[PDB]
Structure formats: C-alpha cells, structure tokens
Amino acid sequence: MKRTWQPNRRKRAKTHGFRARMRTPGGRKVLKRRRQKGRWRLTPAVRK
Amino acid sequence: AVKKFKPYTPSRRFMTVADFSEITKTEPEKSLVKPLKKTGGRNNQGRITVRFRGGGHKRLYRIIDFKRWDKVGIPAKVAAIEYDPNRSARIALLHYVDGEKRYIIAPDGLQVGQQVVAGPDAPIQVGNALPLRFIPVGTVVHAVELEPKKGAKLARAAGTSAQIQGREGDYVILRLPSGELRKVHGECYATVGAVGNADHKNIVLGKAGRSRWLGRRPHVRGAAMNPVDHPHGGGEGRAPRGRPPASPWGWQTKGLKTRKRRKPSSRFIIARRKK
RNA sequence: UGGGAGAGGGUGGUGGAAUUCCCGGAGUAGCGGUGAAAUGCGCAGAUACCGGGAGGAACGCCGAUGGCGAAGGCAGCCACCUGGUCCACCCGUGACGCUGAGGCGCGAAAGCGUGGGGAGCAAACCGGAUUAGAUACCCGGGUAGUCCACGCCCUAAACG
RNA sequence: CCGAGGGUAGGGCCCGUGACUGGGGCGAAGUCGUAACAAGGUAGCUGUACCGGAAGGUGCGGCUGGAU
RNA sequence: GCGGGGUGGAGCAGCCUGGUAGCUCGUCGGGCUCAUAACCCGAAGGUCGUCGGUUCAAAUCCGGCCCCCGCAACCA
RNA sequence: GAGCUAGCCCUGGCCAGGGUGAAGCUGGGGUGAGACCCAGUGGAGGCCCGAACCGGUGGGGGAUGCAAACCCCUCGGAUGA
RNA sequence: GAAUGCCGGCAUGAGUAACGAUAAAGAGGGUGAGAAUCCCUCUCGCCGUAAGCCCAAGGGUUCCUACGCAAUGGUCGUCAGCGUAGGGUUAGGCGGGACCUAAGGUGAAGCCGAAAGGCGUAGCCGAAGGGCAGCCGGUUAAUAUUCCGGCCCUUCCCGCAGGUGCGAUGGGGGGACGCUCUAGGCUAGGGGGACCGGAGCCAUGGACGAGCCCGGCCAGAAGCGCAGGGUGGGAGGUAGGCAAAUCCGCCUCCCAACAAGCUCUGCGUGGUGGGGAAGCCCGGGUGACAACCCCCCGAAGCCAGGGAGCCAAGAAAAGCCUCUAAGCACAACCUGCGGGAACCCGUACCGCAAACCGACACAGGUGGGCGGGUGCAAGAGCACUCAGGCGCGCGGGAGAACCCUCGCCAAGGAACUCUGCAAGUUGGCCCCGUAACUUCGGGAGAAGGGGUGCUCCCUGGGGUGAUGAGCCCCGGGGAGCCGCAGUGAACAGGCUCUGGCGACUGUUUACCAAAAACACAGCUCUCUGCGAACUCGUAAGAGGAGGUAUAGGGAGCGACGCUUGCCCGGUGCCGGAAGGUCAAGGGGAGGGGUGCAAGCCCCGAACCGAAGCCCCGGUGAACGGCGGCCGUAACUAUAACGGUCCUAAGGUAGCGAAAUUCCUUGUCGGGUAAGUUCCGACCUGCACGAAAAGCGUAACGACCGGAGCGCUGUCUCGGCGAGGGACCCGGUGAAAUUGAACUGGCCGUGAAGAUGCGGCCUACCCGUGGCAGGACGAAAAGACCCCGUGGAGCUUUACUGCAGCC
RNA sequence: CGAUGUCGGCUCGUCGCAUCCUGGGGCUGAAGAAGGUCCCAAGGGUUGGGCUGUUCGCCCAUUAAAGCGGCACGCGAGCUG
Numbered sequence A: 001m002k003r004t005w006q007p008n009r010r011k012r013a014k015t016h017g018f019r020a021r022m023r024t025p026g027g028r029k030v031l032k033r034r035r036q037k038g039r040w041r042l043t044p045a046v047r048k
Numbered sequence B: 001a002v003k004k005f006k007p008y009t010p011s012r013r014f015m016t017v018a019d020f021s022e023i024t025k026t027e028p029e030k031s032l033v034k035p036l037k038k039t040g041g042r043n044n045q046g047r048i049t050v051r052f053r054g055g056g057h058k059r060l061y062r063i064i065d066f067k068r069w070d071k072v073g074i075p076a077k078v079a080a081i082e083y084d085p086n087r088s089a090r091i092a093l094l095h096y097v098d099g100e101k102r103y104i105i106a107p108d109g110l111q112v113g114q115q116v117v118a119g120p121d122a123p124i125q126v127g128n129a130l131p132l133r134f135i136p137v138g139t140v141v142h143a144v145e146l147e148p149k150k151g152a153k154l155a156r157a158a159g160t161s162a163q164i165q166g167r168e169g170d171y172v173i174l175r176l177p178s179g180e181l182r183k184v185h186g187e188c189y190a191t192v193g194a195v196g197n198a199d200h201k202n203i204v205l206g207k208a209g210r211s212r213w214l215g216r217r218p219h220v221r222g223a224a225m226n227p228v229d230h231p232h233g234g235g236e237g238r239a240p241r242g243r244p245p246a247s248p249w250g251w252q253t254k255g256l257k258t259r260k261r262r263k264p265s266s267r268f269i270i271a272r273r274k275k
Numbered sequence C: 001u002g003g004g005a006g007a008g009g010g011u012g013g014u015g016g017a018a019u020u021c022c023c024g025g026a027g028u029a030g031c032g033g034u035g036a037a038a039u040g041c042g043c044a045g046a047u048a049c050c051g052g053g054a055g056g057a058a059c060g061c062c063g064a065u066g067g068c069g070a071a072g073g074c075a076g077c078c079a080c081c082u083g084g085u086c087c088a089c090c091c092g093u094g095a096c097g098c099u100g101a102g103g104c105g106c107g108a109a110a111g112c113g114u115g116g117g118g119a120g121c122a123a124a125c126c127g128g129a130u131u132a133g134a135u136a137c138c139c140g141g142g143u144a145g146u147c148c149a150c151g152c153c154c155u156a157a158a159c160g
Numbered sequence D: 001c002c003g004a005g006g007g008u009a010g011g012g013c014c015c016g017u018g019a020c021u022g023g024g025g026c027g028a029a030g031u032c033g034u035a036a037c038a039a040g041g042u043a044g045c046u047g048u049a050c051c052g053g054a055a056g057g058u059g060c061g062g063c064u065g066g067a068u
Numbered sequence E: 001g002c003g004g005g006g007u008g009g010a011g012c013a014g015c016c017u018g019g020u021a022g023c024u025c026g027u028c029g030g031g032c033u034c035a036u037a038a039c040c041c042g043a044a045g046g047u048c049g050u051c052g053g054u055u056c057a058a059a060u061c062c063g064g065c066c067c068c069c070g071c072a073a074c075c076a
Numbered sequence F: 001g002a003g004c005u006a007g008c009c010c011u012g013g014c015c016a017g018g019g020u021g022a023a024g025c026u027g028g029g030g031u032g033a034g035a036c037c038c039a040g041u042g043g044a045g046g047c048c049c050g051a052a053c054c055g056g057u058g059g060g061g062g063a064u065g066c067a068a069a070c071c072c073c074u075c076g077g078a079u080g081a
Numbered sequence G: 001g002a003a004u005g006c007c008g009g010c011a012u013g014a015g016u017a018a019c020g021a022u023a024a025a026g027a028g029g030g031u032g033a034g035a036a037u038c039c040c041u042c043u044c045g046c047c048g049u050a051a052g053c054c055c056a057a058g059g060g061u062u063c064c065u066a067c068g069c070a071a072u073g074g075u076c077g078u079c080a081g082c083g084u085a086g087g088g089u090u091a092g093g094c095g096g097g098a099c100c101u102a103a104g105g106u107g108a109a110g111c112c113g114a115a116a117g118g119c120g121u122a123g124c125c126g127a128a129g130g131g132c133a134g135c136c137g138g139u140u141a142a143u144a145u146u147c148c149g150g151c152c153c154u155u156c157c158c159g160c161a162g163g164u165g166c167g168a169u170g171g172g173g174g175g176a177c178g179c180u181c182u183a184g185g186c187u188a189g190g191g192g193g194a195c196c197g198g199a200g201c202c203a204u205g206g207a208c209g210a211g212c213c214c215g216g217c218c219a220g221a222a223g224c225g226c227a228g229g230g231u232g233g234g235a236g237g238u239a240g241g242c243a244a245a246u247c248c249g250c251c252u253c254c255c256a257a258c259a260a261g262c263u264c265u266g267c268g269u270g271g272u273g274g275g276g277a278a279g280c281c282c283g284g285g286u287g288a289c290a291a292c293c294c295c296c297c298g299a300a301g302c303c304a305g306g307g308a309g310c311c312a313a314g315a316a317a318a319g320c321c322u323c324u325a326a327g328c329a330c331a332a333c334c335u336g337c338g339g340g341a342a343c344c345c346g347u348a349c350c351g352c353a354a355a356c357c358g359a360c361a362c363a364g365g366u367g368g369g370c371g372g373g374u375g376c377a378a379g380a381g382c383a384c385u386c387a388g389g390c391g392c393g394c395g396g397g398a399g400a401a402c403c404c405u406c407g408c409c410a411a412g413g414a415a416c417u418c419u420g421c422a423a424g425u426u427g428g429c430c431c432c433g434u435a436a437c438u439u440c441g442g443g444a445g446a447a448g449g450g451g452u453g454c455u456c457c458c459u460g461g462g463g464u465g466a467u468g469a470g471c472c473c474c475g476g477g478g479a480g481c482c483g484c485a486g487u488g489a490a491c492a493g494g495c496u497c498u499g500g501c502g503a504c505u506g507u508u509u510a511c512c513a514a515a516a517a518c519a520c521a522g523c524u525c526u527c528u529g530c531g532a533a534c535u536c537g538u539a540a541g542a543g544g545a546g547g548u549a550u551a552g553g554g555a556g557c558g559a560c561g562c563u564u565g566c567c568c569g570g571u572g573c574c575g576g577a578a579g580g581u582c583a584a585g586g587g588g589a590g591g592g593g594u595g596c597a598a599g600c601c602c603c604g605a606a607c608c609g610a611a612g613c614c615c616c617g618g619u620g621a622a623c624g625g626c627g628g629c630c631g632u633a634a635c636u637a638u639a640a641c642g643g644u645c646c647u648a649a650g651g652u653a654g655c656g657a658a659a660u661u662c663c664u665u666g667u668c669g670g671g672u673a674a675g676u677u678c679c680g681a682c683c684u685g686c687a688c689g690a691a692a693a694g695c696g697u698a699a700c701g702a703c704c705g706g707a708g709c710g711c712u713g714u715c716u717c718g719g720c721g722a723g724g725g726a727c728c729c730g731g732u733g734a735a736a737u738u739g740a741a742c743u744g745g746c747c748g749u750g751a752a753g754a755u756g757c758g759g760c761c762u763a764c765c766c767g768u769g770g771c772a773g774g775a776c777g778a779a780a781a782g783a784c785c786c787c788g789u790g791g792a793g794c795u796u797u798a799c800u801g802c803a804g805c806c
Numbered sequence H: 001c002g003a004u005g006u007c008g009g010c011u012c013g014u015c016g017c018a019u020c021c022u023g024g025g026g027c028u029g030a031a032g033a034a035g036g037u038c039c040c041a042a043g044g045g046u047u048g049g050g051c052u053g054u055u056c057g058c059c060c061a062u063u064a065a066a067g068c069g070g071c072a073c074g075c076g077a078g079c080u081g
C-alpha cells in the first residue's frame, strides 16, 4: 500500500534545507549542534 | 418569484431556485471585477476561526459603489441588472453620463433604462441617494451609511429596508431591518426604496450538495461529539444537554446577551430589536 | 341616442376619534374589578391630568322600516379601472326566446399552506371567584386567530 | 392450424369467516350530573374550531324558529 | 441487604421536643323542604399494629415479633 | 515533523459505453381570455445499469505471510457532498 | 550461575518448513573445467486498455563493450541491474532559467511583541497555469526534435531603404477563463478493394484462380483551395479612466450589417526530401525504377477565444495593440531587406517496476498520453489474436492421508445452521406483459413469459456519393436446415410477501464495528446595529466579510405529513436607578506611641460608597419535572362518580410485552405437523410519550428481524475426479522454543491434576508418514479482579487557582 | 494472575450404574392382555424434526426405548464463535 516515504526533491530542500535552517532560531541551533558534533552533513542530501 | 421542480429525483422534490427574471446581463464588467480570495474560514495564522467553511464555487468580486456622494449631481442611466454571487441582493450596472461605470445594489422595482442620481437635491425616487436629513420622514430606504462618509453599512441584504421615523437635531431616527430604533446622522447617505430580490428568503436549498456549493461545509452537533471537544460531548447513548446549553467554547447559548454594555453607540440606540 | 340613483366590485392613496404601548412633564395612596370580592396593577411612584411619539384595527353623527348586488355580502374620504340596473325618446335588428341534466365561476364565519402584520378582542390555556362539584356562567391575564398578500377549503337557521 | 381442457404466473369483482375493535338499536323500577322545553334560571338554534367524565362549554360568524 | 410507615369508619396531623390525641369527610339526633340532596344547629366514636423494657408518667424514647410500602442486589 | 494521514487554499487532469426522458420550446385541442390536455422537439438529475477510477459488504485463503492489513470470489459509489 | 541481565560465540529444532503468484514447458545445436538454468534454432504456452510503447516523479551509472564468477542472485550459472576496466549523455526552436503572475512565502513604508520574534500595502520570490521560434528522415555498440540531411523559423545587434509624432514601469484594450449538452467541416486512427507493386506458393481429396500470402505512405515554406475563429466604419461633443491623451468610456449623427472587407488559425494541395513489406539469403543484402491509387467508417483530437442551455455565476500578470508625459524630434519607433550575434542547466539508463515507495530481484502502492484487429446490441467490458513482451531465478519423480482451488453427482431438497453461512439458481439484447401502495416522479428489470443460430427468396428507409453503382448503417416479410442445446464459448440480476430503524445520495472507528452512528436539506430557540457577535493571537493583526438582520455566530431537532399538552417552587438566562448586603477609596466620632513642646507617628466608630449576591418579576423547541390512599352502579366484575392527603404541576394527543416489559416463552389470534423468534391484537407501560421530539410515511438501504417460491453437496451422506502442495530423489536451507534428560500405564501419595515419589503393571534398540489427549505444551512479567497514600483521560453545585468577562 | 482460554454446539469417544429399552426374576389390590413395585443385569441399543445462542425445557411425528451422570460443567496446539 501507499507507504510514508514519498520522496520529493523540492519538498526535501525546502523543509530540511540549509536555507530553511538558517531562517529560524531553532534551525540555527541544529546547524550549531551538528557542527559541534562533527557531522559530515549538516543538511539532508538532495540533488537540487 | 421562486421556481419549483418536479420530483424526478429525491432532491428536486423540494429544491427551489430564484427566477432570475430581473436579470438582463449575464457576464460582468471586466473593469469592475477582481478575484475574491477564498479563506476557508482560516485567518492569517492559518487557523480556522470560523468553523465549517470552504470548497464553494469560485467567485469574482464585483466592486460596489457604497459611497454615492462620490458623484453628486451627475446622473446615470441603469444599463443592466446582473447576478452577484457575493451578496443576496442583485446588482445594477450604472452608466454615468460621465462615461464612468459603477455597480450599486439594485433596489426593488428599479428599472433598467431609468435614470438615477445622488445629492441633496435629488428627487425622492427609487435609486436616488440623499443625506438622510433631506429624505422625507416616512420613506423606506436602504444602503444607509452609519456615519458620514464611512460607507453604506445598513440594509444591504435582499428585501431589506430601514424606514425614516422622524428627525431630532443633526440625527434622524431609523427603523432598521432588525426592528431596532436608531439615531443615524443626517449627513449619512441612503438610497430610497427597499432592496430587491425579496423572494430570496423563500429559496429551498433542497439538498446537502447545495450547501456545499455555497462554501458551507457540514455543521456537527455538540451532542454528537466527545467531552474533549464540547460541553455537550459524551454520554452513554443519546443525552440531553445536562447543563445549560453551551457553545464549543463554554459560554451559554440560549439567552446570554453578548453586546458590550459600555459601548459608546448605546447613546444612539433608542430601542433594542424586534421579535 | 340622451340621462339617473346607488355601502355593487377591484386597485392606489388618505383623514379624524378611541384603545394599547413608549417618552417628557406635573402629582400621591390607591387603582381596577364585582352580587360582594379576590386574583391583578401600585411608594421600584400606579390610577386621574397635560404634552410628544409609535402602531394596528374599526369608521361615530349622517343612518333610516334606507340604498346596491344573483347570492354570499357591501358603510370615513379621495382618485382611477369595472359590473349591474332604471327612466325617457320609439330610431335600428326582426322571435334572435324561456328554462337548463352535466360543465364552469362565485360562495359568511371558522379552518388550512407560505410569507407578513399584531393595537384591541379572544377559542385553547392559567389564575381569582361562585358552587356539593363548576373542566361553565362572573373577574384578572392570555396563545392561535381576528388584519394584509397569494393559494386552498366549499360548509351554514348560505332563510322569504 | 384451430381446439375441450390441464398446468404455470398475475390481476379484478363478490360471498363467507376472523383475535380484536368502532359506534348503533333495544331492553319495568342501576350510577353521575341537569344540556333542552317557561329569559328553563347564561335566550335557543346553527356551520366551524378548540376543550371537557357526561350531557355540554367557549370563540367567530349567522338565523328568529327569541326577546316582552 | 438499607429507608420510611401502622393512631375514631375513610384519608391525614400529633412522634422529632414524654404529661396535653387534632383536621376534612363519614356516621348519629334535630332543623329547612311537599320530599331527597345541598345547607344550618347539636352529638357520639380512637387509649394509638403487638409483646418486652426506660420512666412518677409512653401513640411519643429504646428493643424484639407481625406485617405495609419503597430503594438496592454491582466486577466477572 | 502535515513527503503518512485530516481540513482548507492555488493551479491542472480524469470519469468507456448504454438507459430513463424534467423544465422549456413548437404545434394541435381548449376557453371570453385562461388553467390545462395531447404530440413532437428537447436533454435536466447529490437519476439508473456498468468499465477506468474511488471503495471495502459477506465469505474463503493467508497467519515464523507474497504482504507489520495481502490474495481470490462476491459487493458499494461511479456528473458528484 | 541465575537479574525474560549485557556483549559475543556456538548449539537445538533439522537435513525439517521453505525456495515468493498453478502463464508451461520440450528438443537439437553451440560454449565451457563444469550447463535443467548462458547463447542460437525449431516446437509449445502466457499478456495484448498489457505483462506492449511514450512522458513526468523518484532513482543516480544501474546504459554500451571487453574481461571475470569469491560474494550478491532464495537452486545452478559459463549469465546478470554483481566484480574490474574502457566507452557513452552534443539543442537559439524540447524542458527550465536570462519573461509573467496564483495560493502562499518574503517584505522598503509602517504596526506590535521582555529577548528570541510576530505581523504588514507596494515591491520581490513562487508553476504542471500565461507566454514563447522545428518538423520528417538518416546515423552509433551506446545520444539524438540535440549530430547529419532536407525543408522552415525566433530574438538580439548593426547597416540600407521606405513610412510615422516618436516616446512608459503610467492610461486603455486584450490576454481572460464555469458546468452540461452540442453544429458544421477536418485530421488522427481503422475497415475493404475484382485496382497498382511483390519474392514466391499449389501440398493431403480439390483449386493455376477475379487464388494464397505481403505491401499500397511520411514531412513539406510561399501560393491557392476548403472550413472556421477574431473584428464594424465615419464624424461632433466630452466634466469619467487620481497628470496628459487623437486612446478607452458616455451622448448624438451618417453608413452598413446570418454577409462583406481586413486579419488569425486548422486542414488539403504544394517546389523538394524521405520512407518503402512479405519472402529468400548472410542486424545487413535482396525484393525494388517497389507500388504508393479508389471506396467506406471516423474521434473524446483540430478549426476554438464556435454554438445553445443552465446557476452554484466560473484567477492573475506579462508578452501584444492603442494612448499620450517627461523627453526627443541629426534622435526614436513601425514595415521591408541584408550581414552579424545567440549564454547557463538537463538530456545516459530503469520508470505499474528486479533500477521508484515498501529492510528483500517483496503477488502491495505509483500521476499523464498512445493503446491495433475480429465477434459478441454498445464499450476502455469479454474471448481470441497483431505489433511488441513474456513463461514469473530451484528442479526431477511419485499419484497416500490431509489441506487448498476447482468439476460432477443417484433419490431427497434447508431435513444443514445462530443464520440458506457458503454454493446453486437467475443472468445480455428484442418483444409481450406487469400488483398493493404512492409524495404521482415512482414502486419497474416489479412479477411472469415468448424470442435469440444457419440458409434461400421478397422488400422498406437512412449515410456517402450524384439523383445511380459500390461501400456503410437501421429494419420488414415468406419459406427452409441442423443439433441435447443457437447471448451454443467468455463477460452479464435469483425472486416475492411482511416488520424494525434511518427519509433520501453521501460520511465514519487507516489496520477487528459501515451501522440504527455522523452529515444532510428543513424546523425552532438564542446571540449579533457593524470597529457586529463570535473565533485565533500577550499584542499588532487577522478570520467573520471587502458580508450588514432575506446577514453572520451558537444550540437542539433532522425530508414530508398530522402534531407537539400541563408545571416558573429549585438551576439557568432575561427585565427591575427601590430596599438589603457589599471591596478599595472617601469620612475621622474617639483613642494610642513618642517628644519639653511645636510636631512626627499608629489604630480607628457612624455615615457616603460598584459589580456580584439577596429580593421582585418574566421565561420551556431553557436545565428539568409531570402523585398517593380509600370508597362507589339492582348478578358478579369493573368503576363514568365521590372522599382525603400531597405537589411547582400531577403524563394531554398518539403509541405500547416495544432496538423500551422485570415476572415472560404474558394472553389471544395468524402463520407451522410442531413457532422462547415473527406478524396482528389486548393493556397493572417493573421502567413509552411529544424537537435528548411523538405517531405515521411513498422512495431509498452491501443495515437487523420473520415467511414463501425458485435452486442447490448446506444436509440425510457421502462418492469420484482435476490441478497446487503434502510424499520420494538432487540443490539451497530457516524459526519460535530449549535447566539438564537415560522423558511408559494404572492406583495412590505429594503445594490439593506426577515420565521424575510409592506399590504394582507393562516395556528389545533406532527411525519414517500421520493424529493431536498430555508435557497444567509455545506466545504475551493477566488487558478481568484486587493492592500501590502509582499514573493518565474525562466530569462536576469537590478544593484551590488561572485565562476571559463584569 | 512472568496466563490453568471462559457457555453452547459439531466431531470423536470412553467410563459409572442410582437401568430408559432389550434379557432373567420375586411380590402384586397379578383372570388374560397390559401395568405397578422391588431384585439381578452395563452386552448392545437409546430416532428425525419446530422454537430458542441456549444447556434445559415445551411441542410435532415416530420408537423396543427416546436413561441419568463422570471424564478440567470431557474434547477451541480438533472445528465453530
């Protein structure tokens, strides 16, 4: 049946993307934390 | 009038539709229409603030002239009478001799082809607009400004009218559609005559679908809900109110008056409404 | 052809008297109601009086044993639209007439549907009396309805 | 081929019968009240409407077959 | 299982707050009436469901027995 | 976090074929005029039958599954809320 | 040594279940160490409104070629979407961007918020909508509207010529719009041809034929032709379109108008360029100088911004055209022609699936277009089949039980069972025919019935053409033929009577309930006079609504019919400048502390003093509520009648053993051989009753009762048969569970149900197929119950606060 | 209570005997026939249907008879629900 993951490149980028994160106080703390933890990706991989 | 149907489906049985007899023009002035931004009862927060709304037929807003003192003394011919989906009343197209074209709501018996005008000196005749101070006591009247230059506010719905009852100082005394007795300032414009399409209220929607076409989504009773939802929610099997009948938000809904007591306009309302 | 009287009918308008309610005024110990009372209303200022307003319904005197209509029925006043009917003249048509099973229309009140309207009155209903009782008669309230528009109902001591 | 009639299916009219139910007629001396006839003690009657144990009551309009 | 009830012939007060039994109707006698009802004047009839106790004193307070009504009897 | 799901907003798309035959219109009849009757024309509808599509009624299977909701048969809606 | 401990390893179950749609295989020939599994050929089967083809998402090298087979692949593997390497994606015209706007987002100005931030006109961003110029063929192992060929086109820049008041982010027009139905004419597509082209072919009884088989086109500028869309022309006035305006709008005048003219598309034609089959040879050659013609059917597509009808009344902005303002009129712009210039990103491949979403090469999910033929009334249905694509990545035998899916069945026919559950029956079209009841539409496919193929003959009408031939569509009539049977296969209602509930189509517990539940048109009450009420928000701001009492919020009821009684004492709400109570504050009688005193300081009575409450009224489609005992009629029985207590008032009409009735299977009647259910009645209604509506009601229902007909493997009562498994052999090979086990019966005993203790009995050792009585078998630290001064949701006249409102 | 699945039905039985029938008896208010009552006897047998979820019961039509109990109210790793 219709499952929950329905990939959409625009959706992905517009929701979890770098510019979404930077626009919001909480979005920025995510970047700060993932940077502090040393994540190789700060933001979901989407091919634009 | 209102027109019936033969019962050839269960719904056509009771359904009735307006006769549209008075209509003479079936598409609007391109220069006088703009798109009506449908809300779905949602506010700028995105939240529903008026329950049960949405999904009605698409509509263009017809810009209406609710001022009239805009064009004192300049006469106009009544070009057509048209359908307006945004209000109960019908509307009349006016071709001013100015060249300018405007919409007004069409008073009862207003005739396509006749002449109307606005100002202190206008003849007391259907379609004319005058400050209330110049309109003879006893005349039925509509599209009444409530305060000078602020726009026609009162008696705009189909078949409605306010009647001038008398004068006092700079104010005139009106009997509103609701039956309330109110002082309105004499400089306030008003159009003489009642609003047309009085048979509006006699329309029988006939089926649920018709509500849906008007953007009216189903209303679900409080008694039909759960306690998390509503004062009347819950109960094993059916239940009476079991408390004074209340709104979804808890306030009482049979009798509880709700207009602010200390409202400044109280000084201008002579007698609370009719029946 | 020329004239007549008339609440005949339909529409639009409109006049004053009275009731009720509202407002201002002035005023105080009761008012109302009956066979008698009580319920009811009244010092939160009623009744009685003056002024202003709102609204509905009905048209006093004229008015009669009167008039008009086929009947039911028709009454302030104005205008318009319309029917019936009588008199005179003795001009025209030349029996073109009487009645009338069916059919069709009209048809008081009450009642019914949709909308409006609602002052007074008032089935139902409530209360106070009376009474053995009083689901009555009397008294105080009172909703349909009584009024308008449209559509139904089609009854009658619709009687001379 | 037609054909008495047999069969299948469904209608129509009539008669009989039916738990129960509706009022009707009648029946020597039952209970309740007293609506009508004398203004019958609220003149009666009336079409309609609503109400009431019952006669009846009341509203609206009508009739005199009532007033004396 | 819990609550209330029993008192002239009928239906109800009095019980809680011990002493003092009342109200309407019914019944009986007498009036009015030609007569009955209505109405008016008088009168009788309850020792209080029963037994036991408390008390100077019990319809009344406390217990047992008879009854008479209500309410309850849920989770499987 | 509304890429599942619920509502709404904007902009697009889809719904084989068959059936029934409303209003109106035309003519005829009818009458003082009407109402109205008949025929033809017409093509309405949360109308009917039924694919796509949307469902998920009953039963059977499956039950360490093909599948953490599926499969077969049957069934609802299918111009509409 | 234990914690259903944690991490890891390795056992058991076990060579067991399984190897993922029952569309299906067989052989020959290659290759290789090795072949059911790779390649080739022939035969067989399956999909064909797809299981074929093309897009868009998403995926991201999986594409092509060489070399490989450790692992991945449910077996095998020489093969592969796997490993290694090399190669492969070409655009002014396709898509997106250097264009436009939609919701929405963002946001100069401005508004608001402790901070973070929230909002907000314009503007900007935002597309699968608007707008915009490329078609046919050829080529690669792999890209192609991109490369090549042929024929077309767009914009930008510069120049030349001609024309003009040129000029805009401003004014105006236009773009520009719904649903259903639909005319004319075309194209796409398809059918036939005795016509044109073509290798060949004559079999097995016959046919050298008007035989069979194959094919008979594609694109194309200017011009022309056919069909259509769009559009009046002139002049005078002019205050309106936030300046101006010759434009547009309004008035007047002349002209002409299902036309015309002008303009714009579609289709046909068209110089030119391409394509071009079967078959037979080795994807290529040939065929072939291939032919390329007529007839019919014909779109949902095109002309398209067409027409009609309807109500629910159907985006914006740019491109474009016109108007003028600054300006500028050596400039500028329009038309024509020429040369030049023309960027960025995508392009491979999968794409209803082994490459996407589902942990898997997973019977699930996934938007748009094309989707051939024949027959069946139609069609995208159904059977077969074209093009094309497949046989589903374990096989080989066997022919048990039992399971699944399927077929048939003697006599009976619901006797099955909670229940006709299930499965039969019926079944399309044509005609005849069709009841109660009804809101007049319906009930209706009611019920029930007849027909249905093939052949010959006669005949009617329509389409195209021409008015005829042919082709195509719709019929009528007569005579015959055959079989068990003519919708001969496939797809395709069983029906009726009578209740309950809900009027109805709809909606719902994704994943145990589809319903009588929710919704619904409609009815009533109530708030709301507009800066409305109400809702979200601390606010600004929004929604309500660019609406205005015929409107908007809340509540109950639920089409429609006939109706909806009595109670206002309590709660609610509504009205009531009196009175009572009442907080802060006002007032300060009279005290008190301190000081030598002026003074400073503290308590403080009467009174005045809001809402709220009290108090007085109203109010039921507001919350709600609507009695008890005793007696009484000339047979009895019963009680129209009376008495008395109590209430705020004592349940009206209608209905009633009911979706409600305890006693209860009440009683009687119906139906049945027999009826705790059903239906109709009665009424001591434990415990109906009038908008938590009452009683009815045509139609409707995958709702729940009861009955009958039809028909049946449901059953008496089972039998046989098919396929897929189960079984055997080769390949691969799990699982929960498991203290260890050398793990019998009885009767006892034991913590009360013993393989394990006692006594007796029985019993050689080990498996395989089966059945499920036990191992208080597995699973899940019972979901019931209780306990915990454990939690959570929900309620209220529990307590105590808070928002909000006064 | 770190789970002993709970009514009835269906299927499949097996056992007890306080015996429903069949067999053997004594007493009888046993004439015969048919009964009553008690004793011995568990080998075999003990029907089909209507109603209800029902066990049970009542009813219909039969019968030699239409027995009563246990087996976790026997039996859901056997089915139903």
Ligand SMILES: CC(=O)c1cccc(N[C@H]2[C@H](N)[C@@](NC(=O)N(C)C)([C@H](C)O)[C@@](C)(O)[C@@]2(O)COC(=O)c2c(C)cccc2O)c1
Residues within 6 Å of the ligand: C034, C035, C129, C130, C137, C138
């Ligand atoms: C004095 C008087 O007229 C009076 C007195 C007492 C009572 C009554 N009752 C009268 C009672 N109020 C009565 N009439 C009434 O009020 N009127 C204004 C006429 C009733 C309400 O309709 C009546 C008809 O019962 C009554 O008129 C007749 O009763 C008697 O006449 C009456 C009775 C019944 C008993 C004794 C005397 C009577 O008159 C009246």
Ligand SMILES: [K+]
Residues within 6 Å of the ligand: E075, E076, G784
């Ligand atoms: K429980």
Ligand SMILES: [Mg+2]
Residues within 6 Å of the ligand: A006
């Ligand atoms: Mg999606």
Ligand SMILES: [Mg+2]
Residues within 6 Å of the ligand: A010
């Ligand atoms: Mg996207």
Ligand SMILES: [Mg+2]
Residues within 6 Å of the ligand: A008, A010, A011, A012
């Ligand atoms: Mg997205």
Ligand SMILES: [Mg+2]
Residues within 6 Å of the ligand: A013, A014, A015, A016, A017, A018, A019, A020, A021
């Ligand atoms: Mg982003």
Ligand SMILES: [Mg+2]
Residues within 6 Å of the ligand: A040
């Ligand atoms: Mg790194």
Ligand SMILES: [Mg+2]
Residues within 6 Å of the ligand: A016, A021, A030, A042, A043, A044
């Ligand atoms: Mg992130």
Ligand SMILES: [Mg+2]
Residues within 6 Å of the ligand: B003, B004, B005, B006, B012, B013, B014, B015, B016
């Ligand atoms: Mg209608």
Ligand SMILES: [Mg+2]
Residues within 6 Å of the ligand: B018, B019, B020, B021, B022, B023, B090, B197
């Ligand atoms: Mg109109």
Ligand SMILES: [Mg+2]
Residues within 6 Å of the ligand: B030, B031, B032, B033
């Ligand atoms: Mg516009």
Ligand SMILES: [Mg+2]
Residues within 6 Å of the ligand: B044, B045
């Ligand atoms: Mg916003």
Ligand SMILES: [Mg+2]
Residues within 6 Å of the ligand: B045
């Ligand atoms: Mg936001």
Ligand SMILES: [Mg+2]
Residues within 6 Å of the ligand: B049, B050, B051, G535
């Ligand atoms: Mg709201």
Ligand SMILES: [Mg+2]
Residues within 6 Å of the ligand: B040, B041, B042, B048, B049, B050, B051, B052, B053, B054
């Ligand atoms: Mg809403």
Ligand SMILES: [Mg+2]
Residues within 6 Å of the ligand: B082, B083, B084, B085, B087, B088, B089, B090, B091
């Ligand atoms: Mg309108």
